[PDB]
Amino acid sequence: DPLTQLSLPPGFRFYPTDEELMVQYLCRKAAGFSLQLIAEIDLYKFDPWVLPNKALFGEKEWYFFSNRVSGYWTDKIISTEGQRVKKALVFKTNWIMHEYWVLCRIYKKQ
Amino acid sequence: GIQETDPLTQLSLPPGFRFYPTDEELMVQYLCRKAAGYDLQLIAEIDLYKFDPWVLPNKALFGEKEWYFFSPNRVAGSGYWKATGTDKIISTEGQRVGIKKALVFYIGKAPKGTKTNWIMHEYRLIEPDWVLCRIYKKQ
């Protein structure tokens, strides 16, 4: 478990912004992670509900590098520094995927 | 002396890690722990009611859009903090109850001072000696 070894103080979480995800992770995946908090997974060898286990960490959301495949799956222009470089999906279920090698947040709703 | 470290984060926190505490954390891990007597120090002790809200950000050891403080209607600097909406209860197993109270800053006398966007959430424990406050600006 990587999070424990970061000696993270009570209340310190991973609340990344759509901008940070772009530049610091996705962009950094070309030639880029000292401690790879989010790993690779072929996200569609799977049904939404078991991914959390194979995420390296997470309480309520999970992040992965990756009508598509027991079931199947408006995006807004993200800009950084006023210069541009995300898509929402559903599995019908509380199972939501955020799409940004691509970077995805998965979480359960309501 | 030889090096003594400075206010902030040492933590080499991986890009993406805020301090987004939950109401339970602020209660248990901070407010309660302070109130018990602890000490990686993270939340500034400050008399909030000494200062205008906009001078505050610089006094928190960190914070991008908000600032936590421990502090020992009411009146502060050029104005006054106004209680708001309804206080919200927080209960931690097995025991402690704390109240989040919401307040807004007004410049001037009491009535009828002129409203601002300065918001304060105040976390206080209930017992039979501090408060914990989030300060931030609306919008």
Curated annotation (Swiss-Prot), chain B:
Membrane spanning stretches: none
At the top level, the lineage of the source is: Eukaryota
The listed locations are: Nucleus
Q: In which tissues is it expressed?
A: Expressed in stems, flowers, cauline leaves and rosettes.
NAC domain: residues covered: 13-138
What the record says about the induction of its expression is: Induced by drought, high salinity and abscisic acid (ABA). Slightly up-regulated by jasmonic acid. Not induced by cold treatment.
Q: Report the protein's function.
A: Transcription factors that bind specifically to the 5'-CATGTG-3' motif.
Q: What is known of its domains?
A: The NAC domain includes a DNA-binding domain and a dimerization domain.
Query: Assembly and interactions?
Result: Dimer. Interacts with RHA2A, RHA2B or RHG1A, but not with RHA3A or RHA3B.
Protein name (Swiss-Prot/TrEMBL): NAC domain-containing protein 19
> From which organism does this entry originate?
Arabidopsis thaliana
Residues shown, of full length: 2 to 163 of 317
